Amino acid sequence: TQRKGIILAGGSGTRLHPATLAISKQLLPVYDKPMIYYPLSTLMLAGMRDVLVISTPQDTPRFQQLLGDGSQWGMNLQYAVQPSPDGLAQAFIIGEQFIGNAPSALVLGDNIYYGHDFQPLLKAADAQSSGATVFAYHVHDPERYGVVQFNAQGQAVSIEEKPKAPKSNYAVTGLYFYDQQVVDIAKAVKPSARGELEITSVNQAYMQQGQLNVQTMGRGYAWLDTGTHDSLLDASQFIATLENRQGLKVACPEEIAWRSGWINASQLEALVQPLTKNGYGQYLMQILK
Amino acid sequence: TQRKGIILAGGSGTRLHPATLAISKQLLPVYDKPMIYYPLSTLMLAGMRDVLVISTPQDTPRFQQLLGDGSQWGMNLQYAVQPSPDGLAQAFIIGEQFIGNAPSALVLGDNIYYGHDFQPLLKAADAQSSGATVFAYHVHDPERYGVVQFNAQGQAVSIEEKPKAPKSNYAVTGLYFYDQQVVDIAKAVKPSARGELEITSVNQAYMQQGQLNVQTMGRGYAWLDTGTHDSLLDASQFIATLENRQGLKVACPEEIAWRSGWINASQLEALVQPLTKNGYGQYLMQILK
Numbered sequence: 001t002q003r004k005g006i007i008l009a010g011g012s013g014t015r016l017h018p019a020t021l022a023i024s025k026q027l028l029p030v031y032d033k034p035m036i037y038y039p040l041s042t043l044m045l046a047g048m049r050d051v052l053v054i055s056t057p058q059d060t061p062r063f064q065q066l067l068g069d070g071s072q073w074g075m076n077l078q079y080a081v082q083p084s085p086d087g088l089a090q091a092f093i094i095g096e097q098f099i100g101n102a103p104s105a106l107v108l109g110d111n112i113y114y115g116h117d118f119q120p121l122l123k124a125a126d127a128q129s130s131g132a133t134v135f136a137y138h139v140h141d142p143e144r145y146g147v148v149q150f151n152a153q154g155q156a157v158s159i160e161e162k163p164k165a166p167k168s169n170y171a172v173t174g175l176y177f178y179d180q181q182v183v184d185i186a187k188a189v190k191p192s193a194r195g196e197l198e199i200t201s202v203n204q205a206y207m208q209q210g211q212l213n214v215q216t217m218g219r220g221y222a223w224l225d226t227g228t229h230d231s232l233l234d235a236s237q238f239i240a241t242l243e244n245r246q247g248l249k250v251a252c253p254e255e256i257a258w259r260s261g262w263i264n265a266s267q268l269e270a271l272v273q274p275l276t277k278n279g280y281g282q283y284l285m286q287i288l289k
Numbered sequence: 290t291q292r293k294g295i296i297l298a299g300g301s302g303t304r305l306h307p308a309t310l311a312i313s314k315q316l317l318p319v320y321d322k323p324m325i326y327y328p329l330s331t332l333m334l335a336g337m338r339d340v341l342v343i344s345t346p347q348d349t350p351r352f353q354q355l356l357g358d359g360s361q362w363g364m365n366l367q368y369a370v371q372p373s374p375d376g377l378a379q380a381f382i383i384g385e386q387f388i389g390n391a392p393s394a395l396v397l398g399d400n401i402y403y404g405h406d407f408q409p410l411l412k413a414a415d416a417q418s419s420g421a422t423v424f425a426y427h428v429h430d431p432e433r434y435g436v437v438q439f440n441a442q443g444q445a446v447s448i449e450e451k452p453k454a455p456k457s458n459y460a461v462t463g464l465y466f467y468d469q470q471v472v473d474i475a476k477a478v479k480p481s482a483r484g485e486l487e488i489t490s491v492n493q494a495y496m497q498q499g500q501l502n503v504q505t506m507g508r509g510y511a512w513l514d515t516g517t518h519d520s521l522l523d524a525s526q527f528i529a530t531l532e533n534r535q536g537l538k539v540a541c542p543e544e545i546a547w548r549s550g551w552i553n554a555s556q557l558e559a560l561v562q563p564l565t566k567n568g569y570g571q572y573l574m575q576i577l578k
């Protein structure tokens with residue numbers, strides 16, 4: 001698709017200290033791979049090869065060294081900086097030149113998704129010609145998230161950021177698909193009651209035009225909380241369980257790129273040569289033979 | 290008390306890629322805290338306030354970033370670089386000026402110990418007037434480690450690396466105490482068949498002089514493998530289980546410094562302020578009240 005992706009990987013906050021004294025949160029391992037691999041692979045599964053990584057002045061070079069320009073994966077990776085964490089909607093203001101007049105998508109750098117049918121779900125969001133698509137996930141504590149109520153036709157009826165006051169149990173997750181209107185909408189967002197340039201404001205605008213579609217991630221879908229140390233440990237336990245007990249690989253960009261045809265097997269084998277020592281590399285070998 | 294400590298944190302190796310593409314192995318989080326905190330707190334529990342961190346050219350500034358000079362913990366941290374991974378014994382040549390004519394201790398940057406009687410075990414080793422002390426951990430498969438056989442008085446009689454026939458079930462761990470002879474002893478080590486200046490040669494010299502004592506860590510002690518992604522995850526699970534079920538922290542330098550009297554309660558409250566968000570900081574608050 002001509003859709004282009006943004007990962008917002010900015011300020012984690014002190015919540016994960018002292019672990020995050022060492023590194024920024026989206027570079028911490030979730031099981032065997034850096035956190036940023038999971039939302040990146042989400043964009044890749046949706047078909048986006050053009051990805052803008054937005055991070056802090058201090059951390060952007062660290063991502064640059066980890067990921068490079070993405071040509072090793074048949075991708076084009078670019079970088080821009082958020083000087084202060086003023087809101088998710090700022091991603092489209094920082095990302096205006098990279099987006100051009102293409103449809104776009106935003107995923108948060110600490111959002112980890114899993115689902116057996118997730119790729120058909122992503123591809124379907126990518127196929128909407130217009131409007132916006134958010135992803136709804138059942139949680140037991142909606143007051144901590146953005147909450148949506150929708151018309152069962154996939155049409156949202158209300159959307160509230162951290163309501164006192166919650167109108168449903170469906171949290172809006174950190175994955176958003178948009179047509180060409182979002183940049184101008186984002187530029188017009190005013191700071192919310194909590195002082196933030198909220199993506200919820202963006203989605204409310206789409207909802208008022210009747211252009212907010214909601215994809216449900218119900219039974220079988222995982223959306224991992226990376227907010228706390230305990231929830232980070234749970235995220236690692238989950239990924240390790242899928243890979244060791246069920247023989248599944250989550251968020252391996254080399255595999256996704258090869259199976260998407262963005263690199264060939266010769267390019268893929270070249271990627272494995274410096275990784276031959278451990279199971280991550282031996283998996284890429286097992287998948288080549 | 291007058292003893293000075295070294296942490297040797299060497300090359301991560303491709304074994305933990307791609308996670309260690311982002312961060313050095315000894316900066317990976319073990320539950321809520323960077324790995325390096327664990328061997329550090331071990332030196333701290335032994336009473337050492339002066340610690341030299343030896344690492345690779347590429348990784349040494351990262352540790353300085355995380356830890357600073359240690360003055361926040363009433364300590365004095367210094368840094369030197371191992372230019373090439375030519376063996377563990379080099380730490381005593383590199384650290385020769387830091388050591389002076391003092392007793393010393395060496396711990397490997399990836400060694401995580403826990404046991405109810407660990408501090409008394411360390412202090413007893415620290416109290417040795419002369420000679421050297423190694424720390425042996427009871428294993429069910431001694432053939433996989435370097436094995437020490439010792440007399441009924443705690444004096445080492447043999448030390449063999451990966452014995453096809455074990456003379457004991459006690460593996461030598463990466464924690465070593467030495468008198469003032471070690472800097473000179475290390476200088477006399479010849480390169481092994483591994484092309485490295487091995488600590489085993491250092492320990493052999495003390496044993497050849499009949500001055501190698503062995504502390505055994507049996508019932509009640511844990512010694513965690515950090516070699517693989519699976520074992521790293523299990524290490525995190527271990528720490529999280531003990532800390533949440535038993536109301537204790539493993540390798541919390543702030544706590545060790547406060548309880549040892551190296552900082553006062555006002556100083557400790559200052560350190561806690563940036564950690565208020567999580568369970569690590571709120572633990573320190575509970576002990577303040």
Ligand SMILES: Cc1cn([C@H]2C[C@H](O)[C@@H](CO)O2)c(=O)[nH]c1=O
Nearest residue numbers: 008009010011085086087088110
């Ligand atoms: C509000 C905000 C959050 N974030 C990131 C940090 C959080 O880990 C995550 C929120 O789930 O998104 C940014 O990168 N920039 C911002 O402006």
